[PDB]
Amino acid sequence: GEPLYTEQDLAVNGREGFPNYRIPALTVTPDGDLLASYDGRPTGIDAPGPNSILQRRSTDGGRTWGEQQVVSAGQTTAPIKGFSDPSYLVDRETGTIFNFHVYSQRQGFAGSRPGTDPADPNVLHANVATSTDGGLTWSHRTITADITPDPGWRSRFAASGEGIQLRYGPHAGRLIQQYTIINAAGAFQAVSVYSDDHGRTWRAGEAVGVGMDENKTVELSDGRVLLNSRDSARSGYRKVAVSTDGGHSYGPVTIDRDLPDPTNNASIIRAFPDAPAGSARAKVLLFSNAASQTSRSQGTIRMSCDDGQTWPVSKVFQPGSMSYSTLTALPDGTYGLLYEPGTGIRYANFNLAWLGGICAPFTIPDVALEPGQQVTVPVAVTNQSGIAVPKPSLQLDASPDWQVQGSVEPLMPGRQAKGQVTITVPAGTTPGRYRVGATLRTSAGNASTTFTVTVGLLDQARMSIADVDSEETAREDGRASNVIDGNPSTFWHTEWSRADAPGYPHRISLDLGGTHTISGLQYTRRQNSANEQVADYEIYTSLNGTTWDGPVASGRFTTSLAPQRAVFPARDARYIRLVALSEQTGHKYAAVAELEVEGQR
Ligand code: NA
C-alpha cells in the first residue's frame, strides 16, 4: 500500500547501563512478539571482555518496546566471564526459541586455544540459551563439544543475526545456525551447526572456504541452502556457496560482484517464508548490508526475484554510518530491521512498497570505444508477475559531457524485453574505466544495473606477460599476469620472503598481442598493503621484443589508490615494459594490482 519506513532506537550508548551496545539480533516469537537482542559492552570491546547478552521485547508489533532484560550476564569481577554476539533461531514447529552466543573467559576469537573443556578458560566456547516460554526464561548449555568434530577447530563463534528452520524436502524441520571456525592451518571457514531433533542435540556439518567469516544461510525456492559470507580476505564483496543436502556441505565458494561489502556482517532472508516450494514467492530474497566497500556506511536493502541470481532492486535505508544489520519477516507483512547506526542499536520497519520495485533484472554489455565515437548497445530485460508495463524508461548515469540515451520496448508478463543505449564520448575524454548506472523507471517500481565503458585502452584479453624479474607464487598468488585481468584485488608480487629474493631494480613486460599505436600506461597500486608500492619508474617499448627502446617516460608515481598515468608521445610498439627503480617507502618489493595500456585497438 502506502510506502512505510519508520525507526526508533532500542539502545543508546551510555544510557541504560552500558557505555557500548553492539551486535544486533532480531526474531519474532511464535505469538507475534518481536524480540531484539544485543551486546551490552561494559568495556566497549567484544570477547573475552565482560560483555552481557540483553533483550528488549515488543508485544504490539514493534511500536513500543519493553524494559531491557539480561539473557546471559557477564562477570566483570574476576574471574571475568562474557557473553557476546547473539543470534536467534526459532523452531516454528515446537515454539522453542534459541539465542546462540559466544561464552568467553580468558580468550577471544583470535586467542582461543584448542579444546572443548567448558572449564578450560582458554577456549572461546559456543553457548546456546533455550527458552520454552517465548523468551521469558532461559536455559544455558555449552555445546562446544557437540560442534567441534575436528580437534583442529581451535576457535569459533556463531554469526549474529538469526538462524533458520528448513521447510522443504527430507530435512524439513532442521534448525541451522552458522558459525566461523579457525581450523588447524590458521584458516577461517564457514560451518553450519544444525539439529534434527528440535535442538536437543547440535552437530556440526562440513566446513567451507578459506577467508570466510560471519556467514548467513537461506532456504531457496527448491530446498537448496544458499550461504552468504563476509570476506575476511577483504575483496569488497560477499562470497557465496550453495548446498543441496542434509549432512551439510556446500559447493565451491565464489565472489558475488553485485554484492559490494566493506567486509562486514549482512542479512539475507526469504521475503515470503511460508511460500510453497517452486512458487514465485519462495524465490524472493531480501538482503541488507553496507553498500560501501571502503566504509561501513550506505546501508541499502536489495531484492532478488530469482533465488539470488539477480539483484535488481535496491534502496538506501541509511546513507550515513551503518555497520551490522539484521532482518526479520513480520507477521503483518512488513519486515523488521535492527541495525547499528553508530549510536547503539536502532529498530526500523519497512514494507515492500517503500523499496521501489519491479522484479525486472536487466543487462547491458560492457563497451570499449575510442574518444569522439558513438556506440549503441542492446539492453535485455527479464520480466516478473503483474508486469504489463507499456511505458518503461531508461535513465543512464554518467559524466555530464557524455551523451547517453536509452530505450526499452514494453514489458509483457513473464517475457524478455529489448532496448538499446547510445553513448557518445567527447574527444577530450581521458582514457578508460567508466562505470555507467542504468535505471529502469516504471510505474510499478525500479530496477537498476551498471555496465562499463572503457575509453582508449587496449584489450587485456589480448595481452600476455613477455617477461618479469620475479613472481611470488609459493606463499601467495603474486603472479605477473594478475596485472592484466581487470581486477584491482589481484596483484603481481615480487618473490617475497620465504625465499630471500632480489632487491629493487624490478620489472615487468607485456606482449600487447600485435603492433598498436600507444601513448600511455596506467597502473594501480596494490590496494591493501603499502610496502610494495612503486615509486621511481621508467618505461621502454619494443616491437621485435628483444631490443627495447627508451626510456620513453620516467617519473615517480604517488601513493594514489586510483590509476596513475605515464604518458608519452604516441608511438608503435608490440610490447611495453615498466621498470620499477624504487619503492615509495624504501622497502624491497614491488606489487601491481593492474596495468592498463592507452592506445588504439
Ligand atoms: Na589484478
Swiss-Prot record:
Keywords: Glycosidase, Hydrolase, Repeat, Secreted, Signal
Domain of life: Bacteria
All copies of domain F5/8 type C, residue ranges: 450-600
GO terms for cellular component: cytoplasm; extracellular region; intracellular membrane-bounded organelle; membrane
Residues annotated as the enzyme's active site: 46, 214, 324
Catalytic activity entry: Hydrolysis of alpha-(2->3)-, alpha-(2->6)-, alpha-(2->8)- glycosidic linkages of terminal sialic acid residues in oligosaccharides, glycoproteins, glycolipids, colominic acid and synthetic substrates
Keyword Magnesium (UniProt): no
Primary site of residence: secreted
Gene Ontology terms: biological process: ganglioside catabolic process; oligosaccharide catabolic process
Gene3D superfamilies: 2.120.10.10, Galactose-binding domain-like, Immunoglobulins
Cited InterPro entries: A-galactase_NEW3, FA58C, Galactose-bd-like_sf, Ig-like_fold, Ig_E-set, Sialidase, Sialidase_fam, Sialidase_sf
Pfam families assigned to the protein according to its UniProt record, in alphabetical order: BNR_2, F5_F8_type_C, NPCBM_assoc
Residue sites binding substrate per the record: 22, 230
Broad EC category: hydrolase
Subcellular location: Secreted
Chain positions of BNR repeats: 56-67, 129-140, 193-204, 241-252, 302-313
Induction comment from the UniProt entry of this chain: By N-acetylneuraminic acid, colominic acid, and sialic acid.
GO molecular function: exo-alpha-sialidase activity
UniProt key word Repeat: yes
Enzyme Commission number: 3.2.1.18
Family: Belongs to the glycosyl hydrolase 33 family.
Function per UniProt: To release sialic acids for use as carbon and energy sources for this non-pathogenic bacterium while in pathogenic microorganisms, sialidases have been suggested to be pathogenic factors.
UniProt-recorded name of the protein: Sialidase
Organism this protein belongs to: Micromonospora viridifaciens
Organism lineage: Bacteria, Bacillati, Actinomycetota, Actinomycetes, Micromonosporales
